Amino acid sequence: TARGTPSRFLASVLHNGLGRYVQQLQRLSFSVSRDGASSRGAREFVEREVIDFARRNPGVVIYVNSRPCCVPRVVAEYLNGAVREESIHCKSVEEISTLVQKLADQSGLDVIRIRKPFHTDNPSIQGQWHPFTNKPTTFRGLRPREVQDP
Amino acid sequence: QLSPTELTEMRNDLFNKEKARQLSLTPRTEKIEVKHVGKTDPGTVFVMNKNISTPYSCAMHLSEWYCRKSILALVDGQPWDMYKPLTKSCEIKFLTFKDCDPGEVNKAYWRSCAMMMGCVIERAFKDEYMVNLVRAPEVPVISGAFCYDVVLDSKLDEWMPTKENLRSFTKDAHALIYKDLPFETLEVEAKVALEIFQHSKYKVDFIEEKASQNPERIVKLHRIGDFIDVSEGPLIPRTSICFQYEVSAVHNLQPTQPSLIRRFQGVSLPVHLRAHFTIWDKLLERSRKMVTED
Amino acid sequence: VKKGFRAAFRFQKELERQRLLRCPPPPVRRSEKPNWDYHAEIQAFGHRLQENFSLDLLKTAFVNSCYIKSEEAKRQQLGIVLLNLKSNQELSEQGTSFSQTCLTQFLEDEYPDMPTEGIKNLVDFLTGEEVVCHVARNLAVEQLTLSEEFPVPPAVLQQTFFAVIGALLQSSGPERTALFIRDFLITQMTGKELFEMWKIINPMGLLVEELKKRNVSAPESRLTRQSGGTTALPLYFVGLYCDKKLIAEGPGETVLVAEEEAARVALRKLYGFTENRRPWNYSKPK
Amino acid sequence: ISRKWEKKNKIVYPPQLPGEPRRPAEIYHCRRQIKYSKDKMWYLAKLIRGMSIDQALAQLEFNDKKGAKIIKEVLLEAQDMAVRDHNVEFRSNLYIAESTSGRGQCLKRIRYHGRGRFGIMEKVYCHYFVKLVEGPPPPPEPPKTAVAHAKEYIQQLRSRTIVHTL
Amino acid sequence: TYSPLPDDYNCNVELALTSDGRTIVCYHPSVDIPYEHTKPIPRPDHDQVLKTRLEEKVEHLEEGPMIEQLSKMFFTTKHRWYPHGRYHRCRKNLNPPKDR
Amino acid sequence: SSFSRAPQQWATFARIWYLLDGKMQPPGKLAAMASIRLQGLHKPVYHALSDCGDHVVIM
C-alpha cells in the first residue's frame, strides 16, 4: 504494498447508475494473427464469440484487425479516457470470453488500492458531531467560574 | 474641481503622453557613437540607440561595478542623469560619491533628497488641509541640510510639527526608499510643463523663471513614482541610494504676513557614504538649525 | 555481446517507454489514431445512452462552424464538389433553450421556496462551461466533435453538448429529452451545498430581505457557544433569533464568520435546500 | 564519455510571437579534464550559484584555491561567448544559473607504502559545468515568516478529516 | 416521570415498541437552544493633522524566538516548526486523493 | 446540519477548554480524567493521528 503504490477513493464516472446506467467501455480493439499458434484462441473467439458479444453490447465499438503478430492483444478504451491493454496470447476462447466480459463490466478507473469500501456525499442526516453536540446550554451562557453582573 | 487623487492622475497622463511623443520623433533605430573618456576602461566606444539608450545602459555594457557606483554621468562635460536618454554622439564619464571632486554628484544627491521630501509632505497631511509646494531652495551641502519651501493651509498657521510628527515624515520617506523608485526625467518645452502645473501658482512662476533662463524654453521635469516635480539640475538614479534619511525640523520664514512659507529641512547620506550612529547624531543636530539660502 | 534476441527486444520496448515519458508526445484527436470509424462511433454514442437518435441530426450536432471554415481554407489552398455541411448552431440554440427551461421547471418543482435568482444561478451552474464540459468529455462527445482545434475549446465543447440535446429533442421529443437532462445534468449537483453552486455576498443582507417578505421580524445575533475566545484557535456558534426563536445557528473561527455562516444556514432552511433534505427522486415516473 | 553539455548551445528555438515575453538567453559552457578533484571543485561551483557574472568573478578572483582561477577563466569565456555568439546585449546582464563539478576520466598510478605494500594512486581529474542566463540574479527566497508559519499550521488543521469512518 | 437519559441536551428521546413488539420506534426531535441561555454578540471596539499611517507591524524575529512565539500561541512543542530536508519535502504527495 | 464545509470541519475538530477543581481530590483520579481529555479520547471523532486533544485546566 500500500505504501509503495498509489491509492484513490471509491468513485463512479458521472454518478453512473444514479439516473441511468451507462456502460463505460466504449471501444475494444483486437489484434489477431491469421497464422500464429498464439492467436489460435483469438481466431476462434472472432469466429464464434465476437459477433454475439457485439450484439449484446451495442454501445461498444469493436475493431478486429487481422495482421501478423506474435502477441495478440485487446485494447479496451473507456468513456473517462482510460486505456487498458490486455494480452490474449495463447488464451483459449473461454479465457478470452471471460477477459472480454470483465473489461465490459469495469468502469475504467485505475485498479489500485481503494481506501474505503464505501463512498457517500451525505454522510450525516442529523448533523455531524461537534464538541457541543451533547453539551447542555447554561443560563446566560455563563462560563465556569464566571460572575454575572460583573 | 479636481481632488488630490484626481490631480495626480491628470499630471501623470500628461507626463506619459509627452514621454511617448518624444520617442515617436525618431521612428527608426539610430546609432550614436558614445566614447568613454573616463580614467578607467579608456577608449571604450558604445554604439547606443539614439533617444532610447541612457548612460546606465552604457554602464551595463562595462560592468556591474559601474552600475552600482555611477551616481551621475558627464555627457560632453555636462552633468547628465543616469537614466536620461543620450540624444547624440558624445563623450561620457561616470561620477561617483568618492571622486576627488564630487561637487556635481553632491548637488544631484541634495536635489533628489529634497524632491523626496516634497513627495512625503505633500501626501502626509489630511485631505481637508491643502499643501502647496513653493520650491526647493538650492542650499550648499555644507549648510548641513536640504530644505523644501511649502505653504501650508491657513488653518494650520498655528500648528507646528511635533517630534512625533517629524518621525512620521521620515517613516514615509524611508517607505519611499524601500520602494526603490527610479528618478525619471523629461525635458519638455515650457508650454507642456505649464499645463501639468496649472493648478499651482507657485510652480507656474518657477516654470516661467527657469524657462526664461534657457533660450529654447525647455524645463527639466522629474517624477518619483506618481509624484511629478520641477527640478533645476540632474537627479540621482534611484531613491534606494539613500540609506540614512531624516526630516530634521520645520521653520517658518518671515515675512509671515503675505504668506506663511514653512521651510521643511532634512539631512541624508547615501549607502556609499554611511556614517556611524554617533556621527549621524551630530549631523542630525545641525540639520535641525534653520538654513538661510544665500 | 551475449547471443539472443528476446532480451534485446524487450529492452528496446523498455527504452521506448522512457523515450515517451521523457518527451510526452503532443496529444491528438482520437479520430486520427488507429481503430476509428466515425459512422460506427456515432451509432454507438446513441445506443450507449439508450437513446434513439436520428443519425442525420446527431451527425449535424457535432459539426461546429469553426470546423466548416477550417475545412474550406484547407480545400482552397490545396486546390482540387460543393460542400453543403450544416453547422450545429441551430441545434445548439434549441438545445440550450430547452435545457434552460427544462432545468428551471425541474428546480422550481423541487424547491418551490427558492427565489428566482437562486433558481437562475443553479441553472447557470448546471449549464455552465465547467459542468457541461466535464459531462461532455465523459460521454465521448469530444471524441465525436468536429472542430479546428484539439483539445476542443471549452466554448465549442459546450455548444456541441447542447447541440446533441437539440438533436435528441427533435428525435425523441421533450419528455425523453427531459430524462436525459435529469440523468446527466441534475445529477451534477449531487453532494454540492447550495452556495457552492450559487455564489452570494453578504448573506445576512439577503436573509433580512427574505424575512421581510415573509413578515418575520429582523434576526438577532447571539452567542450560543464559545470556546477558547482568547486563543489563536477559537470556536464560536452564533444563533439567529426571530422573536426570541432560533431559526439558524452557525460555527466560525470568529464571531463575524460565525454570524455570516448562521445567515447561510438560515437561507438554506428558508429555500428548502438543507443538507438533509429529501434526495432527488430518480424513480421512473409511475 | 558523455558530452551533452556542449550540445545544449546548439538548440534553436522557433521565432517568438510579438505577444510572448522575451525569452532570456541561456549559455552552456564547461571545461573538461581539469586537474583537480570534483570534491574540492564542488565548493567553488557551489559558491557562485545564483550570483551575477560580475559578483562571481569578484569572489573567485580573491579565492586562494587553485580551482577558482580555472572557473574564472571558464566564466570569462562564457561571458564573451554569450555576447558574441548568443546575441546577449550587456555582458554584465548575466547570472550563474547552474554551476557544478563532475568526475573526470582519472589515471591510476602505481604508488608505494611505507612497509613495501603495492598501491594504486589515482590522479584525479574533474569537469566544471556552468549555465549562464540573461538577466539579473533571481532574488533569494526570503525567510519563512511567523505569519507564513501560522497560515501553514492552520491550513493543516483545516485539512483534517475524520479518519477511518463513513 | 422517568427518562432513560436527560432531555436537556441534543434531543428529546421517546422510546416506544410497536403493538406487535417487533419494532422499536424512537422519536428524537432537536432541542433548540433557549434564547435565555445565549449571550449578546460582543460589539467590536485631538490634533491629528497628519494622515493616519498604515505602519507595517511586520517585525523581524530570529528563528528561536519566532518558533517560541508560534509554539506558545498554538500550544505546541517547538519541533513541528522546524523545517525538514529535501528528501521528506519531495516525498510528500502534493495531489492527495480527496473524498467528497 | 447544513453548515459550510469549512465551518463544519472547524467545529468538529475545535479545541475545548475544561476546568477541573483539585481540592481534596486524589491526583490519579484527576490525572485519569485529564489524560482522556488531553488525548481527545472523549470524542467520537478520536483518532491518534488526528490532533484532537483538548485543553485541561486544573486548579
Swiss-Prot record, chain A:
Q: In which tissues is it expressed?
A: High relative levels in skeletal muscle and testis. Lower levels of expression in the heart, brain, placenta, lung, liver, kidney, pancreas, spleen, thymus, prostate, ovary, small intestine, colon and leukocytes. Expression is coregulated with TWNK.
**Where does this polypeptide localize?**
Mitochondrion
Q: One biological-process term from Gene Ontology?
A: mitochondrial translation
Per the record, its GO cellular-component terms are: mitochondrial inner membrane; mitochondrial large ribosomal subunit; mitochondrial ribosome; mitochondrion
Domain of life from the UniProt record:
Eukaryota
Residues making up the signal peptide according to the UniProt record = none
Identify a single GO molecular function assigned to this protein. Answer: RNA binding
Q: Which UniProt keywords apply?
A: Mitochondrion, Ribonucleoprotein, Ribosomal protein, Transit peptide
Q: Is Nuclease a UniProt keyword of this protein?
A: no
Q: Which family does it belong to?
A: Belongs to the mitochondrion-specific ribosomal protein mL43 family.
Q: What is this protein called?
A: Large ribosomal subunit protein mL43
- Species source reads Homo sapiens
What's the encoding gene here?
A: MRPL43
Which residues of the intact protein are shown?
2 to 151 of 215
UniProtKB/Swiss-Prot annotation, chain C:
List the GO terms this entry assigns under cellular component, sorted alphabetically: mitochondrial inner membrane; mitochondrial large ribosomal subunit; mitochondrion; nuclear body; nucleoplasm; nucleus; plasma membrane
Q: What is this protein called?
A: Large ribosomal subunit protein mL44
List the EC numbers from the record.
3.1.26.-
Keyword Kinase assigned to the entry: answer is no
- Coiled-coil spans are none
The family database entries (InterPro entries) matched by this protein are listed as: dsRBD_dom, Ribosomal_mL44_DSRM_metazoa, RM44_endonuclase, RNase_III_sf
Q: What is this protein's function per UniProt?
A: Component of the 39S subunit of mitochondrial ribosome. May have a function in the assembly/stability of nascent mitochondrial polypeptides exiting the ribosome.
The listed locations are: Mitochondrion
Q: Name one GO biological process term.
A: RNA processing
Q: How does it assemble?
A: Component of the mitochondrial large ribosomal subunit (mt-LSU). Mature mammalian 55S mitochondrial ribosomes consist of a small (28S) and a large (39S) subunit. The 28S small subunit contains a 12S ribosomal RNA (12S mt-rRNA) and 30 different proteins. The 39S large subunit contains a 16S rRNA (16S mt-rRNA), a copy of mitochondrial valine transfer RNA (mt-tRNA(Val)), which plays an integral structural role, and 52 different proteins.
Q: MF terms per GO, please?
A: double-stranded RNA binding; endonuclease activity; RNA binding
User: PANTHER family attached here?
Assistant: LARGE RIBOSOMAL SUBUNIT PROTEIN ML44 (PTHR11207:SF5), RIBONUCLEASE III (PTHR11207)
Where is it predominantly found? mitochondrion
Q: Which residues form the DRBM domain?
A: 202-272
Query: Keyword Nuclease on this protein?
Result: yes
Q: Which family does it belong to?
A: Belongs to the ribonuclease III family. Mitochondrion-specific ribosomal protein mL44 subfamily.
Using the chain's own numbering, where are the disulfide bonds?
none
Q: Per its UniProt record, what Pfam families does this chain match?
A: DSRM_MRPL44, RM44_endonuclase
Q: Which residues form the RNase III domain?
A: 56-194
Where does the source fall among the domains of life? Eukaryota
From Swiss-Prot, chain E:
Q: Name one GO molecular function term.
A: structural constituent of ribosome
Which residues of the whole protein does the chain here span?
35 to 142 of 142
Q: Which UniProt keywords apply?
A: Mitochondrion, Ribonucleoprotein, Ribosomal protein, Transit peptide
Q: Provide a GO CC annotation, any one.
A: mitochondrial inner membrane
Family named by the database record: Belongs to the mitochondrion-specific ribosomal protein mL42 family.
GO biological process: what's one of them? mitochondrial translation
List the subcellular locations. Answer: Mitochondrion
Quaternary context: Component of the mitochondrial large ribosomal subunit (mt-LSU). Mature mammalian 55S mitochondrial ribosomes consist of a small (28S) and a large (39S) subunit. The 28S small subunit contains a 12S ribosomal RNA (12S mt-rRNA) and 30 different proteins. The 39S large subunit contains a 16S rRNA (16S mt-rRNA), a copy of mitochondrial valine transfer RNA (mt-tRNA(Val)), which plays an integral structural role, and 52 different proteins.
Name of the protein described by the UniProt record: Large ribosomal subunit protein mL42
The organism's place on the tree of life at top rank: Eukaryota
Query: Is Transit peptide among the key words of this record?
Result: yes
Curated annotation (Swiss-Prot), chain F:
Chain positions with N-acetylserine modification: 1
State the compartments where it is located. Mitochondrion
Listed as disulfide-bonded, the cysteine pairs are none
Where are the bilayer-spanning segments? none
What's the family?
Belongs to the universal ribosomal protein uL13 family.
- Summary of subunit composition and partner proteins: Component of the mitochondrial large ribosomal subunit (mt-LSU). Mature mammalian 55S mitochondrial ribosomes consist of a small (28S) and a large (39S) subunit. The 28S small subunit contains a 12S ribosomal RNA (12S mt-rRNA) and 30 different proteins. The 39S large subunit contains a 16S rRNA (16S mt-rRNA), a copy of mitochondrial valine transfer RNA (mt-tRNA(Val)), which plays an integral structural role, and 52 different proteins. Interacts with OXA1L.
Q: What is this protein called?
A: Large ribosomal subunit protein uL13m
- Species of origin reads Homo sapiens (Human)
High-level lineage: Eukaryota, Metazoa, Chordata, Craniata, Vertebrata
